[PDB]
Amino acid sequence: SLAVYRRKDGGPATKFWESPETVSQLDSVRVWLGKHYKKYVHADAPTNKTLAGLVVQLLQFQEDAFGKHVTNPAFTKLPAKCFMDFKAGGALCHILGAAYKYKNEQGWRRFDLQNPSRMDRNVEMFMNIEKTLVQNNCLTRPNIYLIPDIDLKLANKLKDIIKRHQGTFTDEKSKASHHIYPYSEEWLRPVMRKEKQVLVHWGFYPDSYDTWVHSNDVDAEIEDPPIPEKPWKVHVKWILDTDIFNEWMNEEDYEVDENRKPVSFRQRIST
């Protein structure tokens, strides 16, 4: 099976971030930072490759501090998709901007993420990054409605998980981002192409486990992702698996219709 390639942890795909093409994609991020976070990046005047290296350090830090292997993590992982938004003014801009702003406000001389002596204030930096993403409408954490058929004990467990992962829950279905239904294999979905490589998403793994594999190992085309339609209809394992990975899972893997039947908007490819 192709799962021999599957990432064993949700740390950064270092080869992607060191690619010359990825470094060149950060040019517009660098330029945008020099205007909209000018007070906080002028000192360091970071290059495209320095920014790529900082992304790797930030991604490695949150996997080390908040990944699946951690018991009692102090924070929930930021969505991997946030780091892949290279548009001027997008999520990566605000992640890097917030990081440099926080460093400046704390008087740090350098970022020190690989250093175990420096985790409690690095955790606070990630809480600040998440606040900045929410405030700039790059990130919305789930506001969840539980369908009435979910029984009391299971609902109680789900509410605990939701709250511990920066989510909220509501009794007003029309205001919810997600509707959760009762739950009634080994597959992947290709999601991005770059030269002769394809990024694949593994079913029931979070996006930080997405893995770059050879294009000729996936005989399927990348289908367009679903257009966001409020609300997502997913079954309870979307929340239960979020607690395993300390990372909100991908709704597409858990989607159902209003009669709880599984929905696969994009085709699932057996591994």
Is 170 strand, coil or helix? coil
Single out the residue in 135, 165, 197 at which a domain terminates: 135
Residues 268 and 146 placed together within one structural domain of the fold: yes
Residues 109 and 225 placed together within one structural domain of the fold: no
Residues 115 and 180 placed together within one structural domain of the fold: no
Query: What's the reported resolution, in angstroms, to a tenth?
Result: 1.6
Closest CA to 80 of 193, 199, 216, 180: 199
How far is CA 66 from each of CA 13, 62, 123, 144, 156, rounded to the nearest angstrom? 17, 5, 9, 23, 24
What lies within 8 Å, CB to CB, of 150 at 6+ separation is: 158, 180, 181, 182, 236
The Cα 186–Cα 142 span in angstroms is 27
The Cα 40–Cα 187 span in angstroms is 44
Residues 153 and 240 placed together within one structural domain of the fold: yes
How far is CA 206 from each of CA 67, 168, 209, 212, rounded to the nearest angstrom? 11, 20, 6, 15
> Rounded to 5 degrees, what are φ and ψ at 254?
-120, 10
Residues 84 and 197 placed together within one structural domain of the fold: no
Residues 145 and 128 placed together within one structural domain of the fold: no
Residues 122 and 177 placed together within one structural domain of the fold: no
Question: How deeply is 69 buried, as exposed, middle or buried, from its count of CB atoms within 10 A (0-12, 13-18, 19+)?
Answer: exposed
Residues 14 and 84 placed together within one structural domain of the fold: yes
HSE-CB of 154 using CA atoms within 13 angstroms: 15
Total domains in the chain come to 2
Name the method of structure determination.
X-ray
What lies within 8 Å, CB to CB, of 259 at 6+ separation is: none
Question: How deeply is 196 buried, as exposed, middle or buried, from its count of CB atoms within 10 A (0-12, 13-18, 19+)?
Answer: exposed
Single out the residue in 84, 107, 135 at which a domain terminates: 135
Residues 113 and 51 placed together within one structural domain of the fold: yes
Residues 119 and 184 placed together within one structural domain of the fold: no
Q: Domain limits at 156? A: 141-271
Amino acid 62 reads Q
The Cα 243–Cα 9 span in angstroms is 15
Is 175 strand, coil or helix? helix
Single out the residue in 115, 135, 155 at which a domain terminates: 135
Cβ atoms within 10 Å of 178's Cβ, excluding its own: 22
Residues 66 and 114 placed together within one structural domain of the fold: yes
**For tokens 């394809």, what's the residue?**
198
Question: How deeply is 109 buried, as exposed, middle or buried, from its count of CB atoms within 10 A (0-12, 13-18, 19+)?
Answer: exposed
What lies within 8 Å, CB to CB, of 252 at 6+ separation is: 189, 225, 226, 265, 266
Amino acid 164 reads R
Residues 100 and 223 placed together within one structural domain of the fold: no
Cα Rg of the chain (Å, integer): 19
What lies within 8 Å, CB to CB, of 191 at 6+ separation is: 199, 200, 201, 210, 222, 225
The Cα 100–Cα 94 span in angstroms is 10
Closest CA to 140 of 175, 159, 167, 160: 167
Closest CA to 233 of 182, 178, 183: 178
CATH number at residue 163: 3.40.50.10190
